[PDB]
Every structure is written in structure tokens, then in C-alpha cells.
Amino acid sequence: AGITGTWYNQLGSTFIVTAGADGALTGTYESASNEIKRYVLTGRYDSAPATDGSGTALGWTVAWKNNYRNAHSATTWSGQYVGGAEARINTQWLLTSGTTEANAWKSTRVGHDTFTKVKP
Amino acid sequence: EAGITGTWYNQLGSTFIVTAGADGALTGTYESAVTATSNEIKRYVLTGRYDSAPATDGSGTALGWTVAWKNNYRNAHSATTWSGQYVGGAEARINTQWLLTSGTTEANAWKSTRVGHDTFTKVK
Amino acid sequence: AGITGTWYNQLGSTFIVTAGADGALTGTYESASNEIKRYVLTGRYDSAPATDGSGTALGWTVAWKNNYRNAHSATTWSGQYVGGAEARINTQWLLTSGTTEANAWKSTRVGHDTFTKVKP
Amino acid sequence: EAGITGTWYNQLGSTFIVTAGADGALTGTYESAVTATSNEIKRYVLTGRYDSAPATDGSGTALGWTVAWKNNYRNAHSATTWSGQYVGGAEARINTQWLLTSGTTEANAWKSTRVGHDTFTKVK
Numbered sequence: 061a062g063i064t065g066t067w068y069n070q071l072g073s074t075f076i077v078t079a080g081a082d083g084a085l086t087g088t089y090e091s092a093s094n095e096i097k098r099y100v101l102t103g104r105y106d107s108a109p110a111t112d113g114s115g116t117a118l119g120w121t122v123a124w125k126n127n128y129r130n131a132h133s134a135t136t137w138s139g140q141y142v143g144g145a146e147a148r149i150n151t152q153w154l155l156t157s158g159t160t161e162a163n164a165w166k167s168t169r170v171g172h173d174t175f176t177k178v179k180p
Numbered sequence: 181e182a183g184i185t186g187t188w189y190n191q192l193g194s195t196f197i198v199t200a201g202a203d204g205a206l207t208g209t210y211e212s213a214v215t216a217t218s219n220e221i222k223r224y225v226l227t228g229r230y231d232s233a234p235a236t237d238g239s240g241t242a243l244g245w246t247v248a249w250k251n252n253y254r255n256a257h258s259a260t261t262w263s264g265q266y267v268g269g270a271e272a273r274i275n276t277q278w279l280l281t282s283g284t285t286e287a288n289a290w291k292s293t294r295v296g297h298d299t300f301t302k303v304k
Numbered sequence: 305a306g307i308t309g310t311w312y313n314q315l316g317s318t319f320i321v322t323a324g325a326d327g328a329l330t331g332t333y334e335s336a337s338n339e340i341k342r343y344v345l346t347g348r349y350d351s352a353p354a355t356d357g358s359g360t361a362l363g364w365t366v367a368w369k370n371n372y373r374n375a376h377s378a379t380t381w382s383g384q385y386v387g388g389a390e391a392r393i394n395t396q397w398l399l400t401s402g403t404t405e406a407n408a409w410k411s412t413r414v415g416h417d418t419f420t421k422v423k424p
Numbered sequence: 425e426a427g428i429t430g431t432w433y434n435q436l437g438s439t440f441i442v443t444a445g446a447d448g449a450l451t452g453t454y455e456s457a458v459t460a461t462s463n464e465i466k467r468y469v470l471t472g473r474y475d476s477a478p479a480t481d482g483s484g485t486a487l488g489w490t491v492a493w494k495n496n497y498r499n500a501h502s503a504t505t506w507s508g509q510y511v512g513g514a515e516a517r518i519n520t521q522w523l524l525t526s527g528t529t530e531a532n533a534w535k536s537t538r539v540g541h542d543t544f545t546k547v548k
């Protein structure tokens with residue numbers, strides 16, 4: 061819809077996603093050869109957003125295991141899509157690593173990514 | 181990573197029913213606590229991912245999932261993601277932090293996202 | 305030092321701070337007449353940062369009560385100062401409102417502010 | 425807002441000793457859990473703010489504070505802020521979420537900040 065396609069964040073990463081008609085998000089995420097760096101993503105979005113000019117709520121997850129590498133971690137992005145001539149997906153994210161119990165307190169990093177339709 | 185499929189309950193009275201696929205998929209349903217309302221009216225689709233080959237040094241299993249708060253009955257114009265780890269054994273837990281983003285106008289975007297933490301156990 | 309002075313974020317807010325020699329931060333925060341909008345801030349920073357080009361860790365708190373208004377809430381900013389010709393204070397923040405027990409789950413909002421030495 | 429001054433303990437074995445001033449100041453010390461180390465080597469200055477006139481409808485008292493992890497003995501080149509609310513009565517609590525930012529190079533800034541939650545009680 062407005063979401064399906066390729067998106068680029070400030071870090072050099074690339075997000076390719078299909079938004080299904082009833083709320084599914086499926087795709088690949090490439091962190092900053094390209095194929096070693098590509099990971100599955102899945103998520104959900106609001107397939108009927110409000111009609112008052114509000115953004116479209118959405119989230120997705122990447123677990124950082126593919127056929128080549130396993131970082132033993134997962135990131136979730138939570139945010140909203142904003143359409144128009146300067147379309148954005150504005151997110152906050154949580155990256156949790158698998159840890160022992162003694163290290164669990166420091167298992168989760170937090171940050172923010174802004175995605176645009178063109179590269180920075 | 182073994183150990184995730186099944187029913188989980190958090191401190192808020194929510195129920196999380198998930199299947200963990202062999203290659204890292206999470207699929208299932210998430211139900212909010214109800215008192216007056218019938219259960220299925222507050223049941224929502226979830227999807228996510230988990231580490232299907234965790235380190236076998238006693239570390240937890242990294243995972244995450246998303247609920248968009250739209251179903252056939254209700255739409256809150258919002259989405260939550262949970263990020264955390266599964267810890268196995270006799271008192272198994274899924275320990276998470278979450279981000280809840282509401283769809284807002286640009287002027288309200290700064291206040292769009294709530295943060296919290298949910299601890300899931302196998303008993304209510 | 306590099307921190308003391310006036311800082312401006314993307315939202316229209318103004319942060320005026322003094323960094324004391326041993327780690328104190330004291331000042332006023334003005335959210336976007338000016339005086340009704342001004343609140344006390346206090347915090348801490350690393351008064352001896354690493355010498356490898358790293359930023360300077362710091363945090364502060366504003367409780368949103370002044371002589372005129374009380375929102376029954378408090379924000380903390382956590383971040384790092386980065387000096388040089390384009391100096392920044394890059395932060396993530398948590399805004400917690402006072403709530404009943406039943407509403408506590410939704411008490412805390414999270415976001416990010418980037419502060420510069422000139423207005424946006 | 426009354427009720428905050430004194431000693432508080434979290435689930436990680438840390439000790440938080442704070443004075444709440446009449447107009448909203450928080451001042452005190454924060455000590456990490458120790459096993460081999462002497463207590464004062466892991467004790468740090470804190471400052472913060474709280475709502476000194478909370479709503480008297482059973483709501484909690486909003487507050488926050490900061491520790492920069494430098495003392496006369498050690499420097500971790502980091503700072504934590506806790507944001508939360510004091511809840512009074514017989515099982516009094518300070519329920520918080522926290523952000524821990526490490527000083528990093530620009531290339532490492534994306535991974536500079538950890539997030540978590542601490543529950544403080546009046547007993548260990």
C-alpha cells in the first residue's frame with residue numbers, strides 16, 4: 061500500500077517489505093557480500109488507519125540468525141508510517157541478546173531508526 | 181528455542197499462545213485480559229522471530245514479536261512489539277520489554293510510544 | 305566545559321545547564337509567556353571522559369511542576385555529549401506520569417531528543 | 425511525595441539512599457551490589473527531581489534521578505537515569521524504567537544505550 065517496498069535508515073541499512081491486505085508484514089532486512097547480511101523479517105501493521113491525518117501503527121522483528129551467521133539476538137521495531145511526498149517510517153527499537161541470568165540486566169539495547177524511500 | 185511453543189501468561193492477565201517453527205518463525209494469538217467482554221473479541225494475530233540455535237552455555241533464547249491492535253471487532257490504531265529472551269527449565273520464563281506505538285498526527289508524534297516490561301510464565 | 309550553556313532540540317525546547325567541575329548538572333528546561341513553561345533540572349555527567357574520541361555520558365531529570373503548573377509527571381534524558389564544530393547532546397528519554405495502579409502499565413512514554421548549540 | 429526519603433533496594437542487590445526535599449529535589453547515593461569489593465568503592469552520587477504535590481486520587485508520585493558512574497575510585501564512562509513513580513502504603517514501591525548510556529565513538533553510538541526496569545522496595 062504505502063508501506064510495501066524498500067526503505068533505508070540513517071545507518072546504511074535496507075528494509076524490503078510487503079504489507080498484506082489484512083495486516084501482515086513480511087520481508088528482509090540488510091544491516092549495514094550483501095547476502096551474508098540479509099535476515100528474515102516478519103511483523104504487523106494497522107490495515108485500516110484513522111482518517112484524521114494520523115500515521116499508521118506497525119512493528120516487526122528480525123532474529124539475527126541466517127544461513128551464515130548467528131548473533132544470538134533479536135531486534136523489534138515499533139513505529140508508524142507517515143505518507144505524503146516525504147514519506148517516513150519512524151521507529152524505536154529494542155535489541156535483546158541471549159544472555160546468562162547474571163548478564164540479563166544488560167541484555168537489551170534501545171534506539172531509534174528513521175526510514176525513508178531514498179538513501180541518506 | 182525448543183520450549184517456546186505453547187501458552188504463556190503475563191502479570192497483566194494477558195494470554196500469549198505461540199508456535200515456534202523449526203527455522204525461527206513465531207506465529208500465534210495474543211489476548212488481553214477481559215472482565216465484561218467475551219474472550220475472542222480481545223484476541224489478536226501475532227507474528228515474530230526467535231533464535232532457533234541458541235548458544236548452549238546457559239544463555240537465554242532471543243526473540244521478538246508484534247501485535248497490531250486490529251481484529252475483526254476492534255481497532256486501537258496501535259501496535260506493540262515485545263523483545264526478550266526465553267529462559268527454560270522448571271520455572272520457565274519469557275522476559276520481555278515492549279514498545280507500544282499509537283498512530284498519531286505529526287504534532288502528537290513525540291508522545292506516540294509507550295514502553296514497559298512483561299514477564300511471561302507457564303501459569304496464571 | 306563543553307556542556308555548560310544553552311541547547312535546543314528538534315521540538316522547540318530550550319535546555320540551559322551548568323556542568324560543575326565534579327559532575328553536577330543544574331539548570332532550567334523550557335518546553336515548546338516563557339516563565340510559565342520553565343522547570344528546574346538536575347543531573348550528572350562524566351567529568352573525566354575517555355580519551356579515545358568517545359562521547360561524554362550524562363543524564364538529567366525534570367519534574368513537571370513549577371510555581372504555575374503541575375503535570376504530575378517527570379522526564380529523564382540519558383545520553384552523551386559529542387564536541388567539535390557540530391556539537392550535539394544525543395539523548396533518549398523516559399516520561400513517566402503518576403497513575404493509579406490500574407493505569408501503571410501505560411505510565412511511561414519513550415522518545416529521543418537531539419540537542420544542538422543553534423536552533424533548528 | 426512524603427514517603428520517598430530513606431533506603432530502597434532493587435532486585436539486583438543495589439542500595440538507593442535518597443532525601444526528598446520539600447520543593448522537589450532528590451539527592452543521595454547509589455550503591456551497586458558487591459561481593460569481593462568494599463561497599464564505598466561502588467557508591468555514587470545521585471541527583472533528581474520528584475512531584476512534591478501529587479494528585480491525591482490514589483495516583484503514584486512521578487520522579488526521576490541520574491547516576492554518572494564516576495566516583496573517587498572508578499569510572500565506567502556511563503550514566504543511568506531512572507524514571508518512575510513512588511507508590512505508598514504498606515508494600516511501598518518505587519517502580520522504574522531506566523536508560524544506561526555509555527560514552528562511545530560515533531561509529532558505536534547506535535549501540536550506546538541499554539534499557540531495563542528496576543523495582544525498589546523497603547526490604548532487601
Ligand SMILES: O=C(CCCC[C@@H]1SC[C@@H]2NC(=O)N[C@@H]21)Nc1ccc([N+](=O)[O-])cc1
Nearest residue numbers: 069071073091092124131133135153155173
Ligand atoms: O546483535 C547484533 C545484530 C545486528 C543488530 C543491528 C542493529 S538493529 C537496530 C539498529 N538498526 C539497524 O539498522 N542496525 C542496528 N549486533 C551486535 C550487538 C552487540 C554488539 N556489541 O559489541 O556489543 C555488536 C553487534
Ligand SMILES: O=C(CCCC[C@@H]1SC[C@@H]2NC(=O)N[C@@H]21)Nc1ccc([N+](=O)[O-])cc1
Nearest residue numbers: 190192194249256258260278280298409410
Ligand atoms: O493501544 C492499546 C492496545 C492494547 C495494548 C495492551 C498493552 S501491549 C503492552 C502491555 N502488555 C499487555 O499484555 N497488555 C499491555 N491500548 C491502549 C492504548 C492507550 C490508552 N490510553 O489511555 O492512552 C488505552 C489503551
Ligand SMILES: O=C(CCCC[C@@H]1SC[C@@H]2NC(=O)N[C@@H]21)Nc1ccc([N+](=O)[O-])cc1
Nearest residue numbers: 313315317335336368375377379397399417
Ligand atoms: O507530562 C507532560 C509534561 C511535558 C513533557 C514534555 C516532553 S519531555 C520529552 C520531550 N522533549 C521535550 O522537549 N518535550 C517533550 N506532558 C504531557 C504528557 C501527556 C499528554 N497526553 O496528552 O497524553 C500531554 C502532555
Ligand SMILES: O=C(CCCC[C@@H]1SC[C@@H]2NC(=O)N[C@@H]21)Nc1ccc([N+](=O)[O-])cc1
Nearest residue numbers: 165166434436438493500502504522524542
Ligand atoms: O556502565 C556500567 C555502570 C553500572 C550500571 C549498573 C546498572 S544501572 C541499571 C541497573 N540497576 C542497577 O541497580 N544496576 C544496573 N556498567 C556496565 C556497563 C556495560 C557492561 N558491559 O559488559 O557491556 C558492564 C558493566
